[PDB]
Design a protein around this ligand. Sequence first.
Ligand SMILES: Nc1ncnc2c1ncn2[C@@H]1O[C@H](CSCC[C@H](N)C(=O)O)[C@@H](O)[C@H]1O
Ligand SMILES: [Ca+2]
Length: 213
Amino acid sequence: DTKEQRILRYVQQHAKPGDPQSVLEAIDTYCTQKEWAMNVGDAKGQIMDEVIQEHNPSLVLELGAYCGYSAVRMARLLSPGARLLTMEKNPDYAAITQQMLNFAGLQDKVTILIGASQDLIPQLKKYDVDTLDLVFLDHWKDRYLPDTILLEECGLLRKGTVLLADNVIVPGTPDFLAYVRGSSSFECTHYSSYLEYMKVVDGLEKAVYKGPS
Ligand SMILES: Nc1ncnc2c1ncn2[C@@H]1O[C@H](CSCC[C@H](N)C(=O)O)[C@@H](O)[C@H]1O
Ligand SMILES: [Ca+2]
């Protein structure tokens, strides 16, 4: 029994099926009252809502699904015929995200691609993608810069394609920011958002010296 399964169970018990906004409320409620989880949250979610509405994407790519909160958030605003692709390297998370999408009624608009972004992005052309309208970066932070460049190299960006990256301050993605800001090929805007709490996995390494080689 994992934290992600508990989140899913809570949504299924409490949210109104077929109601994406109800699902978002349930996840937000559970993760502010019972167990914190790394969803993007409602405050950031409102920023994402405005970006989607302002830029009117038909094909969205999400890097990092986890439990599907941001996938539900974005997919519920898409016009008929529009589609969301979300890449998730953790197959347990992908399985949870699918259940979340089913309960929200959005499975017709979202396709989960299981795998690492650095492996799946060079295949997107094979997946019948020409270019993307909007990309949401919310996976491992050391992938922001390489994946952005990878999207360029693979010809998946068009003039006007929007990149929206989360957590560029906390924990921070300074190399990615230096690239897109400094580069004339990217016009950048920053949106601040206050966080009450965030927990990320970290660790220490102990290394005992055993003598030269
Ligand atoms: N290289 C990679 N390719 C695809 N997914 C990745 C990845 N590196 C990390 N991930 C996944 O990205 C997720 C980050 S948490 C993302 C939360 C989600 N965007 C939301 O707001 O609801 C994790 O589930 C992790 O398994
Ligand atoms: Ca995030």
